[PDB]
């Protein structure tokens, strides 16, 4: 039975979806256990128009597993513990000299400028999580567990692996930004390199 390759980052463009470019990675825990969990990093299209929306234009969002609602990406990076905007961009943008990529990241940074606390970001992820959250403490611990295990398992599942997960998430965003700029070609689903 043919299947799409796991533990890889694939960027596709979906016309029907509100996201102009969507990058997906299906992660498995070294095939040892657990079902494959897919995390999507998407960029909203500039077609949506508003006084603030047109100014921000394309804004990046992430569909973390087991969280019902889309989470702004800067919030996820803060939830992993990288609070400073410069550090988040250091993980996302490997060379700060290029202006175009930084311009792409700017709107998503503006969207998440309300949240500057790691604990607050974790609480926000838990609150918008599909599973109900009774209190702030419970929501924070639950969202921390989701980030530790459910999201990007192949990079790490335990052992304080937040830095590795942050680097791989930033790699997914970097690839999405490159696809949006046009520097990298969108991946093809039919390629048999992808079809294990």
């Amino acid at each position: 039975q043919e299947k799409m390759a796991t533990n890889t980052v694939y960027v596709f463009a979906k016309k029907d979806s509100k996201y102009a470019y969507t990058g997906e990675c299906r992660s498995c825990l070294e095939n040892s256990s657990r079902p494959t969990s897919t995390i999507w990093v998407s960029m909203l299209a500039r077609g949506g128009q508003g006084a603030k929306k047109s100014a921000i234009g394309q804004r990046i969002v992430a569909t973390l597993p087991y969280i019902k609602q889309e989470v702004p990406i800067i919030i996820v990076f803060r939830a992993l513990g990288f609070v400073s905007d410069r550090d988040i961009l250091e993980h996302i943008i490997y060379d700060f000299e290029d202006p175009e990529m930084m311009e792409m990241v700017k709107p998503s940074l503006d969207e998440a400028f309300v949240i500057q606390e790691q604990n607050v970001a974790l609480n926000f992820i838990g609150s918008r999580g599909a599973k109900p959250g009774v209190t702030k403490e419970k929501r924070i611990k639950y969202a921390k567990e989701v980030l530790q295990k459910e999201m990007l398992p192949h990079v790490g599942v335990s052992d304080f692996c937040e830095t590795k997960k942050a680097y791989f998430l930033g790699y997914m965003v970097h690839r999405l930004l490159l696809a949006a700029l046009g520097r990298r070609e969108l991946d093809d689903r039919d390629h048999y390199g992808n079809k294990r």
Binding site: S54, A55, G57
Partner: protein
């Protein structure tokens, strides 16, 4: 796939077109319209070109080479070296300066190739932008002799003054963010 290049247009034919007609779909896959010219416009290719220009949607984004938002506290200061000459000429007999001058500046460069292809005029574009936004936008346009076509846009001088004693600390979008929103709206929906 197996139409011909004679059509020189995207055409839906075969089973999908049959389904479109049978289902009376509101949105055809390739809506098309065949325009037959009345008189001399049909005979002469140039007149047909004029009709084409009349019938094809054109926005500022199509004819705009690049847009830059600057901060210039004084219009006479002319932070951009190039606009010094025509800004000085316009401000030799300044218009709307009495109200005020907005410090934030939107500078738009229009590609000459696209401008001449659609036969647009700098004065025409200025009039259309002025009409679309009323007096909220003040536009300065270069002469066509200038090698680079430059349009300089600033927020309303009356709006900059606010013409209000209370002045309302709301400060919506300040002026730079408002200028960015104006640029996006102009590029998308100018309909020149």
């Amino acid at each position: 796939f197996h139409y011909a290049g004679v059509s020189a247009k995207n055409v839906t034919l075969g089973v999908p077109r049959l389904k479109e007609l049978i289902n009376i779909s509101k949105k055809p896959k390739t809506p098309s319209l065949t325009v037959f010219l009345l008189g001399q416009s049909a005979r002469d290719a140039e007149r047909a070109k004029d009709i084409l220009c009349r019938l094809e949607h054109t926005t500022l984004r199509k004819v705009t080479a690049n847009t830059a938002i600057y901060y210039d506290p004084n219009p006479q200061s002319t932070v951009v070296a190039e606009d010094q000459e025509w800004v000085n000429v316009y401000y030799e007999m300044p218009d709307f300066d009495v109200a005020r001058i907005s410090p934030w500046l939107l500078r738009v460069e229009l590609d000459r190739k696209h401008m001449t292809d659609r036969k647009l005029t700098m004065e025409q574009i200025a009039e259309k932008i002025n009409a679309g936004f009323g007096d909220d936008l003040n536009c300065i346009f270069n002469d066509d002799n200038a090698e680079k076509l430059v349009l300089r846009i600033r927020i309303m001088n009356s709006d900059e003054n606010k013409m209000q004693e209370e002045e309302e600390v709301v400060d919506k979008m300040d002026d730079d963010v408002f200028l960015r929103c104006i640029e996006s709206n102009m590029l998308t929906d100018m309909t020149l």
